[PDB]
Symmetry: C5
Subunit: 82 residues, 5 copies
């Protein structure tokens, strides 16, 4: 899991049957200081996240249990402390 | 899943039986600004993608469901992209 | 598995059903000399770790064994380390 | 899957029971330009690859399907790879 | 799988039940020329490896009720890197 920020959204018509009715968001990985590093990822929205919102993204085989999905938002961050 | 652009194609005769009848494409990973970073990967085409087209690539165990030995495959062709900034 | 240090904690109300009643910690990956590298990860606490504690973090499908959406979780609290 | 070149081979007697009778090769990851980058990996040969040959390497859970402890294996030998630019 | 060198060992009492009676080693990832790169990982010893020994480490689901994602699966006898 990692902290990311919805940077945008991706639309695709000719996609896999398992991706039907899914919202594809562009999420940039953040650090502990909430500063975005170069990494960016296309994840599936499940909890219903909006732009600018900091979310918790689970990736890999774990993300399937939300599929050919390998990355999905599994929570919206309320607060963080370091 | 990441954004990629079909750079080319890979041909292989002596391959695994699970790769039978599969088109192996060369896909370079893109950023949010659609600028390709140094990373590149050989992925399996499933939706039927052509050269120069921006596609969505799924990797790992998820790509298998396209007993495969596939660990990366195209699962969609990008229609539009949207980067934003709020407030 | 890697060596990490509990930097902090993450709170989230609107999260996945599998994450209900879970402690989300911010763990920074350490080297063999216990020096934290730039990498940081949000992991689920299972053994009950506190701030400043050095823990062992398991990642991937192995982290599920804590149908979870978990891909990183603390699976042990380090007693001692040695680098011969 | 990525492009790699068989650099060498690794021998091990005291190994797992799933690695019995397996050829362990040292494969260095290549770019799309077939330039070897710093990455190197010990993969299991299945198609029968030799030194200097460019091969396709599958990694992760997919490599098990070659109770294996395999997480990286050669699943094909590259015949030709084409890079392109369109319009 | 990658080439690694047993740098040390990790001890933990409050660990997962699946990790009971397991030897946790500190393994530094090596290159083809056997020079250790910055990467380091805590792996589970299964074949019985000692310090300074070059071992083959399998990672991910392959290493596995286990929560193991990295384990030693062999001790390297010899290596060769044809140029
Ligand atoms: Cl749809
Ligand atoms: Cl043998
Ligand atoms: Cl014990």
């Amino acid at each position: 899991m990692y902290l990311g920020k919805v940077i945008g959204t991706v639309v695709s018509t000719s996609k896999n049957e398992s991706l039907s009715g899914t919202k594809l968001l562009v999420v940039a990985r953040l650090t502990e200081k909430l500063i975005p590093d170069g990494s960016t990822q296309v994840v599936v929205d499940t909890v219903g996240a909006g732009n600018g919102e900091i979310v918790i993204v689970s990736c890999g085989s774990s993300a399937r249990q939300s599929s050919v999905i390998d990355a999905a938002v599994v929570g919206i961050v309320d607060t963080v402390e370091t």
